[PDB]
Symmetry: D2
Subunit: 400 residues, 4 copies
C-alpha cells in the first residue's frame, strides 16, 4: 500500500512550483497547510476506527522526507505535527483519544507547539498556576513555536508554581490556539526555514482545563527518567529532524543534477565536451549520492525499529538507549552530509548558478544551515562517543 506516499509525492510536486517565491516572502504558508489538511496525511497515525489512515511510522518518515525535498518549511511543519502528535499519543487518556482523534480528522487539526524559551540557557519561566476544579493558568512567553500560526491546537509546556502539590513540575496541555490570552506574535524572520512560523507566543492568564492536561504534572519527568514508553518521544522526534535533512539533501542533489544536465557548460579548456561527462563533476555527484544512498538505507532501517518499539507494551532502557544511539548517529551523518552537499554542489553547476540569485539554489543550504542548529551536533557526537567508549546510554530528556 503506497497510496499515502503517492499523495505525499503529489503534494511535494505542487509545493516545488511555488516554493521559490513563497519562502522569500516568509510568513505563513496558509494555502499549502490547507492542501496538507485536504490530503488526509495529518491523520496517518490515527487508527481507521477513529477515522484516520491507520498507517505506520515508516510511512510518516518517508512522507516527511519527500515533502522536505520540495519545501523544507512545509516538511518541517508536517514533521513537527507528528512530533506533537507522538507526544499527545504517548500521554493522552483513552477518553482524550476517543474524542480528540475523531475531532482531529473532522476539523483537520494541524498541530503546533510552544515549548522552548529564550532564556539565558536552553534548560523555563512559563508558569502553570493551579486554579479550582483542577485547572491551571499559564503565564509567560515561549520562543521558537514552530507551526504556531494557523495551528488548530497548541501543545504547550509549563512548570508549576504556587502549587501545594509541588512546584517546578512539568505540565503539558493540548489547547485551542484561539483560547483567550494566547498571543501568536509573528516575529519569525530567519535565514532559512522561513515559512515555519517559529516565532514567539505569549500567554496572558490562559486557562487550561483538566480534560486538556496530558498526564499529571511531572508525569513526563517520571516517564522519561524510568524509560517508560513516552521516552520514545525523543528518538522519534530526532529521527524526524534526520529525515528533514535527508530530504533537503536529496532535493538539492536532484535540483543540481537537473541544472547540470540542462544548463551547465563544459570546461572545454580542458577538452570536456559536455559537463555531464566531466570527471570532477561526476566525482562530486558520486561522492554525495553515495553517502545519501547509505544514509537513506540506514534511516529506513531505524524507522522500522521505531515502529517495532512503538508497538511494544514496554520498552527497556537498553532498547530505548540503543534506538537513541542509532537515531543520533543518523542525525549526525545527515547533518554533515546536508551541510556539505548544499554548499559544494555549486562546484558541479558553475558560476551562473550563483550569478542569478533568482535560481534560488541557496535555499537548500539556508534551510539546512538554520535547522541543523536546533540542537548542537557536537553534543550528539559526544553522546554517541560516551556510549561507545563508556557504555553509557544518553540520559532521556527533551534533547536526548
Amino acid at each position: 500500500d503506497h497510496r499515502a506516499l503517492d499523495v505525499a509525492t503529489e503534494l511535494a510536486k505542487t509545493f516545488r512550483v511555488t516554493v521559490r517565491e513563497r519562502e522569500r516572502a516568509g510568513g505563513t504558508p496558509k494555502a499549502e497547510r490547507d492542501a496538507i489538511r485536504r490530503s488526509g496525511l495529518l491523520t496517518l497515525l490515527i487508527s481507521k476506527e477513529r477515522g484516520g489512515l491507520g498507517e505506520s511510522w515508516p510511512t510518516v518518515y518517508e512522507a516527511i522526507a519527500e515533502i522536505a525535498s520540495a519545501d523544507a518549511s512545509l516538511g518541517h511543519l508536517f514533521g513537527y505535527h507528528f512530533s506533537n502528535f507522538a507526544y499527545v499519543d504517548l500521554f493522552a487518556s483513552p477518553e482524550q483519544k476517543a474524542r480528540w482523534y475523531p475531532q482531529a480528522v473532522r476539523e483537520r487539526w494541524f498541530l503546533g507547539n510552544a515549548s522552548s524559551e529564550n532564556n539565558a540557557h536552553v534548560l523555563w519561566r512559563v508558569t502553570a498556576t493551579p486554579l479550582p476544579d483542577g485547572s491551571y493558568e499559564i503565564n509567560g512567553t515561549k520562543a521558537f513555536c514552530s507551526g504556531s500560526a494557523d495551528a488548530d491546537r497548541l501543545l504547550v509546556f509549563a512548570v508549576t508554581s504556587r502549587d501545594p502539590n509541588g512546584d517546578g513540575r512539568i505540565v503539558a496541555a493540548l489547547i485551542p490556539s484561539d483560547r483567550a490570552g494566547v498571543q501568536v506574535n509573528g516575529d519569525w524572520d530567519s535565514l532559512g526555514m522561513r515559512q515555519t512560523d517559529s516565532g514567539s507566543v505569549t500567554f496572558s492568564g490562559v486557562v487550561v482545563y483538566p480534560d486538556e492536561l496530558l498526564g499529571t504534572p511531572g508525569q513526563v519527568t517520571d516517564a522519561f527518567a524510568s524509560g517508560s514508553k513516552p521516552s520514545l518521544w525523543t528518538p522519534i522526534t530526532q529521527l524526524i529532524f534526520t529525515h528533514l535533512y535527508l530530504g533537503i539533501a536529496r532535493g538539492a542533489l536532484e535540483e543540481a543534477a537537473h541544472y547540470s544536465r540542462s544548463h551547465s557548460r563544459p570546461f572545454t579548456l580542458a577538452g570536456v565536451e559536455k559537463a555531464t561527462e566531466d570527471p570532477y563533476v561526476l566525482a562530486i555527484y558520486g561522492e554525495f549520492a553515495a553517502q545519501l544512498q547509505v544514509a537513506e538505507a540506514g534511516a529506513r532501517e531505524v524507522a522500522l525499529r521505531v515502529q517495532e518499539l512503538w508497538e511494544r507494551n514496554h520498552v527497556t532502557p537498553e532498547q530505548r538507549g540503543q534506538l537513541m544511539v542509532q537515531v543520533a548517529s543518523a542525525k549526525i551523518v545527515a547533518t554533515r552530509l546536508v551541510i556539505e552537499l548544499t554548499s559544494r554542489l555549486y562546484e558541479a553547476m558553475g558560476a551562473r548558478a550563483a550569478a542569478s540569485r533568482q535560481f534560488g539554489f541557496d535555499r537548500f543550504w539556508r534551510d539546512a544551515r538554520t535547522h541543523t542548529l536546533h540542537d548542537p551536533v557536537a553534543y550528539k557526537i559526544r553522546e554517541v562517543g560516551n556510549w561507545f567508549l563508556n557504555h553509557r546510554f544518553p540520559t532521556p530528556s527533551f534533547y536526548s
Copy 2:
C-alpha cells in the same frame, strides 16, 4: 542466530593469536581447519545438499564478525563465498548436485586463481587450449590468488587459445589445487592482509575436464553484457569487501576504546582528570562510531536485497544495476570510514599506543589500506555519479 554465534566464537579465538600470527605471514592452517570444523563454509548450500540453508544477510554478518577479529581470516572466508557465488551462478544443476554434498563432506575451503600481473587488469594471458575430448590445457601464471594455499578447489579463469571456435573467450573451472601442473608459489609478502595467501599460481599443462567447466566459453562475458542474473556476482563480491571494511572498522574502534579505558593518560596540562572524559577523545569515538552505525544499518538493507535477487529465477539489468549502485555506495562510504578511522584513532589513545610497536594496533590500518586498493574507489565514485547524473548503470564486469 546459531550460525552467527558460531562465527562470534571463532572470532573470539582468532583474536587471541592474530597479533603473532600475522607478523609471520604464511598460511593460517589451524585457523582454516577450525573454519572447516565450524560448518560455516556451507552457509549457502541448501539443507537438502547437506548445507546450512542460510542466507546472504547471515553470511555478510559472519564475514564482518570474523574480519573484526582477523582481517586475513575474514577475507579468506569472504572470498570463499565469492568463489561459491560464481560456481552457483554458472554451474549446472547436475554439477551442483555432485559438488555441494562433496563440499560438505570434505569440508571444502575454496580458493581462486583469477587476476594477473600484466600491463593492465583488462589483459589476461593465462590460456585454455581446447583438447579433442572437450578438455582444456591451462598454461600461465596468475597473481593475487587469494586462498590458493590449503585450498580444496581453485576457481580458475583462463582465455581460450589455439581455438578454432574463437580465441580470447573466458572459461572458468573448479579444479583440485594439487592437480598435476598446478604450482602455488607462496610469494605473498604484503603490508596487510598478510595471511590471505594472495600470491601467484603457475599452471603448466594443467588439464581441465569437461565436467569441471562452469558454463561455456565466453558465457560470463555474455552474462555481463546482458546484465542477467550471473552478473550479480560483482555486487555480491563488492558487498563482501564492504563487510570486510566495516568489520575492520568495528574491530579497530573496539580495540582503541579498550586502550583508551585501560592505558590512556589524562592531559592534565589542560585540566582533564580522566582520558575517558576528555571532550576531544569523546568526539573522535562519537564521530566514527556514528558513521559506523549508519553504514552498518544501510549495509543490512543492501544485504537483504542481495538475498532477494539471489532467489529469483531471472534478474533484469535494472535490478542488477540498481543493486550494484547501492553496493558501490556502501563500499565508498565503508572505504572512507575504515581508512580514516584506523589512522585517526591513535589520537584518542596517545603516543604510547604507537611508541610500543608490540601493541600492534597498526594492523588495522595495514589490512584496510591494503584491501581497499583492490579496485579504485575513485571509479566506484564515478560509477555512482554517472548513474545519479546521467541515469547510466555501471557496465557489468569483474569490477563493476
Copy 3:
C-alpha cells in the same frame, strides 16, 4: 605602512554600511568615490608618473583588508589592478606616459568587459581603428568605470579573423551601453552584468598590442602571461579576506550572544571545548594560508620588475598561485558555513544578523573558474613536471 593604514580606514567605514548596501545590490558609488579620493587606485603607478610607487605585496594586503569588510568593494578594487596589470603588460611606453598621469589626475577606477566562439567582434576600419559589436557578460566593475578594458575577436579581417584585440576605452564612448543586469547570490555590488557594444569605434591609440599578441604571449609563457597568476592571486586574497572577516565577525557574536549549552554542564560559550575547536582549526588554517600567500606575492613583485620572464619562471609562479587559491577556496567555503555551529541557532534565526553574506560572497566568486582544474594543474606539475598551459584562466 601608510597605504595599508588608508586601506584599513576605508575598510572600517565600509563595514558600517555593507549589510544594508549589499541587499540593495546596484552600484556602490559613494564607496567607489571614497576609493578614488584615497589615492590607492594609483598604488602600482610609478612615482615618476604621479602614482604611489608601491608593490604587489601592498596591493594584495590592501585587497584582502577591504574584502574582509565588503567583498564587493574588495573585488572591484582587486579587479581594477587586474585591469591595470593587463594595460601595464601590453601598453607601449608612449601609451603609459599619457595614460598613467591621466589616471592619477582623473582618479580612474578601471572596469572590465572581456568574458562572454566569441560573440564580440572587432571589424577593422581603413585607418586602423576597429568597430566593436556584441554583448559581453560578467563585465565586473562596468558601472561608474572611467575606462573599460575590452576584448574582442577580429572579423572580416584580411590579416586574419579570430585574433584577440584588447583596448582601454571610455565607458561613455558612443555605442557603449552598460546594462546594469546584475542580481546575484553574492558579490552583489560588483556590477558584473553585461555591456552592449553597438558600432563602438576603438581608435588605434587605444589598442593594447597587436591582434593576437596576447595569444602569442600565452603560448610563449613570456612576461605578459604573468597577467593570469597575478589575477588569480588577486582572487586568492579576496577569499582570504572574506575568511578573516567571517571569522572575526563570528567571534564577536560568540563573545556577545552565544548561549552556553548548560545541559552539557557548559557555563560559557567561549569556554565550550567544541566552540574553541572550531575557531582553532579555522584560525590555524587561515594563519598558514595567509603566511604562504605573502611569500607568493613577493615572487609576483620579483617577476613584475624583470625585463624578461621565462616560461619556467611563469609556470612555477602559476603553480604557487594555484596552490594558494586551492587552499584559500576550500578554507573560505568551509569556514563561512561551519562557523554557524560555533554561534548557535540564533545566529541563523535572526536573518538580520546577515552572517550568510560571507558564504554567499565566497560561494559566488570561488566559481569564477573551477578549482577542480586548478588542482589538476598543480598535480600535473608535481607528477609530470608539466606547467599549466597559459590562458586567461591558467
Copy 4:
C-alpha cells in the same frame, strides 16, 4: 652561500639509500650520527668564534626538513639536538658557554635528552635531585622517551628537587656525560615509527650532577616560562622543529609516491585510461596534497624567520612570544593534518601493488608521521589557537605550549 643546506642535502641523499633497511632493524644509527658529526652541522648555531658555523634558525629548520624527508629518525635526532642546544643556550651561564661551546665543536657533540617520564600523566615527575655537598645533586629514577640517549656526547636531564633545604619540587636541568657512573641507557625503544631515534628509557642510580653542569638554579625554568622571559622561546622553537619534521616527511612521501606512479602504477584501462599519470583522479590526489604542502612550506618559512628575529632580541614581550607560539601551533596543526592524510591516501594514487609488496616500504612515512604527531595532542594545540582567536588568550607557557 647555501653551503650548510648543500651539506644537509648531501647527507640526506646518502641516508635515503639505506633508510629502508636500517629502520626495519631499529637500534642506533651510529654510522649516520657519525656522518652528521663529521659534517659540522651540529655546530650551526654556535658562533664562528667558539668555532661554530654562525648560522641561523631558518637554515637549521631547512636542514631538519631536508634530512627528515630522507630519514625521519635522523631528522628527529638532528632537530632534537637543536632543541637541546636551544635550552642550553637559553639557560647557560657565560662561563658555561665559554667552556662548552668550543668543547662541543672540538669533540663533535651530538646532544640527547632525558626529560619525560611514564607516570600517571605528563606533569607527574618523580626523578629526584637530592642535594649533595658543595652544591651537587644526586639524580635517581627512570626517564621515558629519551630521544638520542644512545651514543650521546651529553644528556640534557631534568629532575625535581627532593630533601632540599632550599625547597622541594623545584625543576633542575643539567647537561652531563652519558657515561657518568649510574646512568643506564636501557635500549628498550621498539616503536611503530621513528624506529632509529633511540627514544627509550634511561635509569639514573646515584648519578652525581655538579654545579657547573646545572642550567640555572632550581626552579628558574618555571619562572622564566611563567614570566615570558627569553627562555620561554624554547617551546615555540621546539614545536616548530616538530612542524618541519612533518613537512619533511610529507614532501619525501609525496616525491616517493610520484616516482612509483610514474614507473609502476598501471592505468585503469577499464575506464579508458591509457596512462596512470594522465588519470584524472590520480592527478587530483597529487594536486590536492602538493597544493597544501606548498602553502604549508611557504608558511613555515615565514614563522622560521620570526623565530630568528625574536632569538636575537634582548627581551621578548608576552605578546610577541604568544603570537609566535600561536603561529607555530597553527603551522604544526596544518602540517600534522597534512602528513597524516597524505601518507595514507597516496596509496590510492599508486595502486594495490604498492601495498601488496611489503618491501616497497612506503608505509614508513605513515608510521613515522603517525608516531611522532602524537608527541603532544594536536587537539589541544587547536584549542590553544582557538582560545587565542576567540578569547584573546595566549597559551600559558610550558614544556608543551
